[PDB]
């Protein structure tokens, strides 16, 4: 036997004004998978089928299992269980987010912000679409690398302290990275007005380079660097 302790955040919206309380679960690590998600699945399947959580790909390329493990916002299928048996793994939902149930946050606002930047190719002339492929060199293609890979797990935005206090008006790292993702794209023509949409003290300029967004990213991407690069474009673009 090899016992590992898991302390998990629990809140039931059907237990008539129930308080948010922690619940301890014990798992034989020798008969379990290497990842945290495997352990969360195990208690759901064996110990208590009341733990509600988002899961899908178990591969680390969908962003459903995104949560706070031991003070870090990463994917439960990417982060492996701490082999040190003398420690209890504290499992929490994404920071400063509306809790629907156990570890399940309301991301409606997060996706809406991603809709407000318009994440699609915009051409000045649209009459020649769906017939001929647009040209892009391998040199121009490499500029998209490290930006398109974003899986929208919402780890970087929810780790940002500015997004905590100003979540309503500030878009956040994940969304801002995608705004930048369509800026450097050589095919897109609406580069100027994408920057003009950020011409307010809250949309972009609520970032203060705290740098919790890159430090917690499960895919190893650099949103903060991409945000600072927008700021440089904002001060240099003409007309």
């Amino acid at each position: 036997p090899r016992i590992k302790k898991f302390a998990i955040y629990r809140w039931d919206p059907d237990k008539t004004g129930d308080k948010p309380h922690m619940q301890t679960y014990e798992i034989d690590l020798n008969n379990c998978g290497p990842m945290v998600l495997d352990a969360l699945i195990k208690i759901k399947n064996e110990i208590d089928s009341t733990l509600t959580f988002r899961r899908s790909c178990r591969e680390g390329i969908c962003g459903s299992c995104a949560m706070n493990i031991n003070g870090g916002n990463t994917l439960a299928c990417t982060r492996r269980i701490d082999t040190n048996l003398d420690k209890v793994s504290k499992i929490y939902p994404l920071p400063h987010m509306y809790v629907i149930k156990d570890l399940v946050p309301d991301l409606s606002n997060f996706y809406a912000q991603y809709k407000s930047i318009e994440p699609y190719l915009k051409k000045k002339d649209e009459s020649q679409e769906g017939k001929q492929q647009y040209l892009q060199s391998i040199e121009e293609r490499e500029k998209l690398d490290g930006l398109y890979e974003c899986i929208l797990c919402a780890c970087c935005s929810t780790s940002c302290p500015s997004y905590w206090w100003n979540g309503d008006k500030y878009l956040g790292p994940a969304v801002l990275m995608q705004a930048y993702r369509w800026m450097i794209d050589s095919r897109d023509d609406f580069t100027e007005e994408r920057l003009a949409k950020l011409q307010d003290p809250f949309s972009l300029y609520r970032c203060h380079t705290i740098m919790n967004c890159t430090g917690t990213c499960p895919k190893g991407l650099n949103p903060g660097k991409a945000i600072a690069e927008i700021k440089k474009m904002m001060a240099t673009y003409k007309e």
Binding site: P20, G71, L94, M97, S108, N109, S116, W164, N212
Partner: protein
């Protein structure tokens, strides 16, 4: 539905509900880049409080600067006491100065990787101790 409408309908469902906010500051891991950002804001306010308190006293309080120093001279001039009080002036001043450069380096778009943050984070921290001890002995 539109993006602006989706945000407006988000808050109406959450603010008028029993849904609690997830723990944030109580549970999140302490980062060096995060802690150094708090100290930058801390020193920023502390310095701005000092600068404003100096200019505000020049208008409200009577007497010139030459006479104001004499009040400090009136109390026993402790060599280990004056040095410590003088150290507590340049310590928040030089930290903000060296870390201010680090922010300006970031605004150029350089040194924004995790290893570079931890390296430059220590360099600023060390330069502060040296410049604070160094200036206190001027």
């Amino acid at each position: 539905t539109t993006a602006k409408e989706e945000m407006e309908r988000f808050w109406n469902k959450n603010l008028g509900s029993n849904r609690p906010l997830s723990p944030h500051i109580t549970i999140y891991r302490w980062s060096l880049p995060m802690a150094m950002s708090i100290c930058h804001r801390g020193t920023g306010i502390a310095l701005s409080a000092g600068v404003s308190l100096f200019g505000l006293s020049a208008l409200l309080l009577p007497g010139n600067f030459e006479s104001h120093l004499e009040l400090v001279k009136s109390l026993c001039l402790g060599p280990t006491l004056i040095y410590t009080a003088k150290f507590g002036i340049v310590f928040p001043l030089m930290y903000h100065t060296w870390n201010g450069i680090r922010h300006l380096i970031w605004d150029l778009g350089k040194g924004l990787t995790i290893p570079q943050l931890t390296q430059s984070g220590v360099v600023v921290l060390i330069l502060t101790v040296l410049s604070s001890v160094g200036l206190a002995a001027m």
